[PDB]
């Protein structure tokens, strides 16, 4: 095939995606507490049974 195609564009897109910085958020508990948070989420309170059950919905 071809082995000496241009090299100029190496890193193109990463270099030109506009930076936005992480938004400072509440800290999430680590360990047992975190499994706790998941349990009360997934099972205890329950959210929506929109036909089934959803996990990362957005604009539903």
């Amino acid at each position: 095939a071809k082995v000496h195609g241009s090299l100029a564009r190496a890193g193109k897109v990463k270099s030109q995606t506009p930076k936005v910085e992480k938004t400072e958020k509440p800290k999430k508990p680590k360990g047992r507490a975190y499994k706790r948070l998941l349990y009360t989420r997934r099972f205890v309170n329950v959210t929506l049974v929109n036909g089934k059950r959803r996990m990362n919905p957005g604009p539903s």
């Binding site: 047992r32 998941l38 997934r42 099972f43």
Partner: protein, 185 residues
């Protein structure tokens, strides 16, 4: 040239990694008995797995065979000890049954909660790891201590910490330093 220090691993991990049913089924267990790892379930299901293996093997041998009668009876009496196996079901055809939650139910974290002391299974975790509650005056700080029958009665706070008497805590006593300093001399 010095003897091998022997060791063993104490868990097995799920064959299938993303089984949605197993995954939920495991979380609730954690959520219930206040675990932090899937490993705390893994560890137990491993303990379980061998016991079944032992028992399975035994059962194949002849009824009233020496080893079977010896080691079978030993296994039964030991399971009874901690209160996993019930008294009625004392003949190993049932140790062959025997699910994980039975084991779960007998941890020191779980017992410390069951009667009084804790109120919520997590408060139970924190108290133990924090040098409160004991067996004799022997303090225990491992949530997985697994409470033998004659010990269920001797779960109680320890002669140290507050709760079980004698001195409040470093932070309370630090607020007593902010009472008699501000208002007094």
């Amino acid at each position: 040239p010095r003897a091998p220090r022997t060791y063993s691993k104490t868990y097995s991990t799920p064959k299938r990694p993303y089984e949605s049913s197993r995954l939920d089924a495991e979380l609730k267990l954690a959520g219930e008995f206040g675990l932090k790892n899937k490993k705390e379930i893994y560890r137990i299901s491993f303990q379980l797995s061998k016991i079944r293996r032992a028992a399975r093997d035994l059962l194949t041998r002849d009824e009233k065979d020496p080893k079977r009668l010896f080691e079978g009876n030993a296994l039964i009496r030991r399971l009874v000890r901690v209160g996993v196996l019930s008294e009625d079901k004392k003949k190993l055809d049932y140790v062959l049954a025997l699910k994980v939650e039975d084991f779960l139910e007998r941890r020191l974290q779980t017992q410390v909660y069951k009667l009084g002391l804790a109120k919520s299974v997590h408060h139970a975790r924190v108290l133990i790891t924090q040098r409160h509650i004991a067996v004799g005056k022997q303090i225990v700080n491992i949530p997985s201590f697994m409470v033998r029958l004659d010990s269920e009665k001797h779960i109680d706070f320890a002669p140290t910490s507050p709760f079980g008497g004698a001195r409040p805590g470093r932070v309370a006593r630090r607020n007593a330093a902010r009472k008699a300093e501000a208002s007094g001399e």
